[PDB]
Amino acid sequence: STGSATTTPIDSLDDAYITPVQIGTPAQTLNLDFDTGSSDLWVFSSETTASEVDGQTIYTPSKSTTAKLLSGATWSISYGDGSSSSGDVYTDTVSVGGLTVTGQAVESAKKVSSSFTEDSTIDGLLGLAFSTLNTVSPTQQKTFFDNAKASLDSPVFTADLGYHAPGTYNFGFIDTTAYTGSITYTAVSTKQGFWEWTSTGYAVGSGTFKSTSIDGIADTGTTLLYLPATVVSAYWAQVSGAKSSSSVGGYVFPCSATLPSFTFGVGSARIVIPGDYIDFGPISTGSSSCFGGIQSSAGIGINIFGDVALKAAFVVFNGATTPTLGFASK
């Protein structure tokens, strides 16, 4: 089997991407944030504290003839930005772009933090990291991909995120028309539950490539590119007036600037992030200070190849017995 679904930016800055997902019988379509940096499929629901729902579409398990309470199971998750959610668990039928999994754990939110409430466009998350990170207790549950894997034509999914435009998540096949040149594959460590890999270095603009190992995660659920302070300083030093602002919480730059590209290595291959991809617009409405899309990972404890990096590539998440990642230009 295979599946293919379009993923769409939630706003004009590509702050996140949403993908429609069918849950239950008859189908209830919710727009979920596909997140290769976590492993829970959770949704706003009829159980979510009413004051914490503001415009989201909810899953109502009592209206699904295939929903079953997973007795005794609860979940609770925190994310890198300090947001969180928790609740109980149903199993139900879940379909993505024509690919169906029966008995998928659908984690129903009883509580969500303010950032989730305030984002009316995201109805929940669909985790695509390794199932070892799934938070369901006392019986850990499998991700949609793990449940689907054995049925797929090939045990893979691909992320093809757009810059200020829709893109695609495919399951079970590689669309050879969706990228240019070849796909370069690179080793993955699953020790921390992430799609963790080692970039071979970087360049800033038309500058020379610096060969250096950068260990990080491919994380579609993180907006920006978080890299070591040395690398980030080298980037922003090429932008007149750019500076790190403690009050704003990262590097900012004059909105009048033209940003240089940023290149990252994948083995001997190179992925080029155009400068425009690194512009996240005014820090507040009407400001001439703009927020940078490349930020320091110092204090996070891990480097993160988030959407800023991934949307410059066609990315293969290869879930074979020994997982690997693939990157192609597009």
Ligand SMILES: NC1=NCc2ccccc21
């Ligand atoms: N994977 C994620 N990085 C940041 C974040 C916030 C909210 C949900 C998921 C994520």
